[PDB]
Enzyme design. Structure first.
Site, PDB file in Angstrom:
ATOM      1  N   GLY A  70     115.241 -42.075  60.411  1.00 43.74           N
ATOM      2  CA  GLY A  70     115.267 -43.500  60.154  1.00 43.74           C
ATOM      3  C   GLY A  70     116.687 -44.029  60.057  1.00 43.74           C
TER       4      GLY A  70
ATOM      5  N   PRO B  22     108.969 -32.866  53.532  1.00 47.87           N
ATOM      6  CA  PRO B  22     107.897 -33.789  53.928  1.00 47.87           C
ATOM      7  C   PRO B  22     108.413 -35.194  54.221  1.00 47.87           C
ATOM      8  CG  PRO B  22     107.845 -33.356  51.552  1.00 47.87           C
ATOM      9  CD  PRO B  22     108.815 -32.382  52.147  1.00 47.87           C
ATOM     10  N   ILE B  23     109.632 -35.489  53.791  1.00 55.70           N
ATOM     11  CA  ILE B  23     110.183 -36.822  54.012  1.00 55.70           C
ATOM     12  C   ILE B  23     111.626 -36.806  54.514  1.00 55.70           C
ATOM     13  CG2 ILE B  23     108.689 -38.046  52.384  1.00 55.70           C
ATOM     14  CD1 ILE B  23     110.986 -37.769  50.352  1.00 55.70           C
ATOM     15  N   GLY B  24     112.366 -35.748  54.179  1.00 59.62           N
ATOM     16  CA  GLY B  24     113.780 -35.664  54.503  1.00 59.62           C
ATOM     17  C   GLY B  24     114.091 -35.841  55.984  1.00 59.62           C
TER      18      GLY B  24
ATOM     19  N   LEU C 182     113.676 -39.508  56.920  1.00 58.97           N
ATOM     20  CA  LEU C 182     114.795 -40.267  56.370  1.00 58.97           C
ATOM     21  C   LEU C 182     116.046 -40.164  57.257  1.00 58.97           C
ATOM     22  CD1 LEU C 182     114.264 -39.430  52.594  1.00 58.97           C
ATOM     23  CD2 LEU C 182     114.470 -41.741  53.574  1.00 58.97           C
ATOM     24  N   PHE C 183     116.427 -38.937  57.591  1.00 59.61           N
ATOM     25  CA  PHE C 183     117.535 -38.706  58.501  1.00 59.61           C
ATOM     26  C   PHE C 183     117.321 -39.464  59.827  1.00 59.61           C
ATOM     27  CE2 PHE C 183     119.420 -36.468  62.054  1.00 59.61           C
ATOM     28  CZ  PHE C 183     120.731 -36.268  61.657  1.00 59.61           C
TER      29      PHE C 183
ATOM     30  N   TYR D  11     119.442 -20.719  46.647  1.00 60.19           N
ATOM     31  CA  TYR D  11     119.913 -22.085  46.401  1.00 60.19           C
ATOM     32  C   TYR D  11     121.121 -22.097  45.461  1.00 60.19           C
ATOM     33  CZ  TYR D  11     115.370 -23.389  48.448  1.00 60.19           C
ATOM     34  OH  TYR D  11     114.271 -23.525  49.261  1.00 60.19           O
TER      35      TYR D  11
HETATM   36  N1  LIG Z   1     112.124 -41.957  47.430  1.00 56.95           N
HETATM   37  C1  LIG Z   1     113.209 -41.578  48.283  1.00 56.95           C
HETATM   38  N2  LIG Z   1     113.802 -42.489  49.068  1.00 56.95           N
HETATM   39  C2  LIG Z   1     114.820 -42.155  49.883  1.00 56.95           C
HETATM   40  N3  LIG Z   1     115.268 -40.891  49.927  1.00 56.95           N
HETATM   41  C3  LIG Z   1     114.716 -39.930  49.165  1.00 56.95           C
HETATM   42  C4  LIG Z   1     113.667 -40.260  48.326  1.00 56.95           C
HETATM   43  N4  LIG Z   1     113.299 -39.125  47.687  1.00 56.95           N
HETATM   44  C5  LIG Z   1     114.088 -38.123  48.114  1.00 56.95           C
HETATM   45  N5  LIG Z   1     114.963 -38.614  49.013  1.00 56.95           N
HETATM   46  C6  LIG Z   1     115.959 -37.907  49.758  1.00 56.95           C
HETATM   47  O1  LIG Z   1     115.320 -37.113  50.756  1.00 56.95           O
HETATM   48  C7  LIG Z   1     115.880 -35.823  50.760  1.00 56.95           C
HETATM   49  C8  LIG Z   1     114.906 -34.726  50.418  1.00 56.95           C
HETATM   50  O2  LIG Z   1     113.704 -34.602  51.124  1.00 56.95           O
HETATM   51  P1  LIG Z   1     112.993 -33.197  51.350  1.00 56.95           P
HETATM   52  O3  LIG Z   1     111.977 -33.966  52.245  1.00 56.95           O
HETATM   53  O4  LIG Z   1     112.752 -33.148  49.796  1.00 56.95           O
HETATM   54  O5  LIG Z   1     114.431 -32.873  51.860  1.00 56.95           O
HETATM   55  P2  LIG Z   1     114.788 -31.670  52.764  1.00 56.95           P
HETATM   56  O6  LIG Z   1     114.718 -32.127  54.204  1.00 56.95           O
HETATM   57  O7  LIG Z   1     116.193 -31.251  52.410  1.00 56.95           O
HETATM   58  O8  LIG Z   1     113.848 -30.506  52.554  1.00 56.95           O
HETATM   59  C9  LIG Z   1     117.095 -35.935  49.844  1.00 56.95           C
HETATM   60  O9  LIG Z   1     118.198 -36.231  50.625  1.00 56.95           O
HETATM   61  C10 LIG Z   1     116.831 -37.014  48.957  1.00 56.95           C
HETATM   62  O10 LIG Z   1     118.010 -37.695  48.659  1.00 56.95           O
HETATM   63  P3  LIG Z   1     118.269 -38.310  47.236  1.00 56.95           P
HETATM   64  O11 LIG Z   1     118.698 -37.228  46.262  1.00 56.95           O
HETATM   65  O12 LIG Z   1     119.385 -39.340  47.329  1.00 56.95           O
HETATM   66  O13 LIG Z   1     117.009 -38.986  46.728  1.00 56.95           O
END
Ligand SMILES: Nc1ncnc2c1ncn2[C@@H]1O[C@H](COP(=O)(O)OP(=O)(O)O)[C@@H](O)[C@H]1OP(=O)(O)O
Length: 287
Positions: free
Chosen positions: A207, A199-201, A204-205, A50
């Site tokens: 969505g 678990p969420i990223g 989010l992408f 990283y």
């Molecule tokens: N509560 C939240 N709401 C929206 N986006 C969030 C979030 N928490 C983390 N993320 C985003 O979700 C991403 C990380 O999720 P992972 O699920 O931790 O990511 P990755 O797919 O890279 O492993 C980051 O882009 C983070 O962006 P931010 O630094 O702007 O927050």
């Protein structure tokens, strides 16, 4: 913040972990980690690969200087040797194992790493070899526990036969459930902890692309939380042996992620969520 045994060798971590990757401006980065600990997160994940020349590790080590180290579980990794056009090159030679560990110890500025993972499997080297060196590092007390990341089931059993695997880090979320078929049952039969990244990223992408789903938003509303909290809550509910490591660069989202711990879901709630992701004209589109 609930605490859980990850794997069966004694590692204990906060039920929610924190992914340091994204952090790699220093003072800001440190502040996020500090605040994560304030919220009760003690489990911190990084890797030698990283940032630039292991800057993410260096950042975490700096952060640890204003934290009680022995209340913290430091997770870091080795394995990725160079990234080029042709892809990722993995190395698992015992020498590399050892040299990588030492360099991590130095960068983190710690006497020991709690959980040391093989980041990527070296398919040219028998797993027993790479595990053998890690086993040695456990005995010297340089690392306490051993992890695997994105490993074959063959590679998991074989590794575990040489020395107990504490955790398997893999992608798992509402949008990626392929470990459930045999990887999860396997981990549970071997007593290996499960650590989901992204678990969420991924959601989010997804969505954001669609907003450029309603089912999920409607369910988050039903449960009185945001969609990202629902997604995270769903992961948290997949087992006492499941410890996700979402990352953020924003204090606000960190608090949002911690809040996911209050979202309580029944087996029926969960199934409903999984199933969802496989003027008398004033009628709206059904769900
Ligand atoms: N509560 C939240 N709401 C929206 N986006 C969030 C979030 N928490 C983390 N993320 C985003 O979700 C991403 C990380 O999720 P992972 O699920 O931790 O990511 P990755 O797919 O890279 O492993 C980051 O882009 C983070 O962006 P931010 O630094 O702007 O927050």
């Amino acid at each position: 913040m609930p605490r859980v045994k990850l794997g069966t060798q004694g590692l204990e971590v906060s039920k929610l972990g924190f992914g340091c990757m994204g952090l790699s401006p220093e003072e800001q980065g440190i502040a996020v980690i500090k605040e994560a600990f304030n919220c009760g997160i003690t489990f911190f994940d990084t890797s030698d690969i990283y940032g630039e020349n292991g800057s993410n590790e260096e950042l975490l080590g700096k952060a640890l200087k204003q934290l009680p180290r022995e209340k913290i579980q430091v997770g870091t990794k080795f394995g990725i040797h160079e990234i080029g056009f042709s892809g990722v090159k993995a190395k698992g030679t015992p020498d590399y194992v050892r040299s990588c560990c030492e360099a991590s110890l130095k960068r983190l500025d710690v006497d020991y790493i709690d959980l040391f993972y093989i980041h990527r499997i070296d398919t040219t080297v028998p797993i027993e070899i790479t595990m053998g060196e890690l086993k040695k590092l456990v005995e010297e007390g340089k690392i306490k526990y051993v992890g695997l990341s994105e490993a074959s089931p063959d590679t998991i059993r074989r590794a575990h036969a040489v020395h107990p695997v504490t955790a398997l880090q893999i992608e798992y979320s509402l949008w990626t459930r392929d470990i459930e078929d045999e990887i999860v049952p396997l981990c549970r039969q071997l007593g290996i902890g499960i650590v989901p990244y992204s678990p969420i990223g991924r959601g989010l992408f997804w969505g954001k692309a669609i907003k450029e789903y309603y089912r999920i938003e409607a369910l988050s509303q039903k449960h009185g939380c945001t969609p990202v909290q629902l997604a995270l809550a769903w992961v948290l509910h997949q087992g006492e042996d499941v410890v996700p490591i979402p990352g953020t660069t924003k204090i606000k989202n960190l608090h949002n992620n911690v809040g996911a711990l209050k979202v309580k879901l029944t087996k029926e709630d969960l199934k409903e969520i999984s199933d969802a992701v496989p003027w008398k004209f004033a009628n709206t589109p059904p769900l």
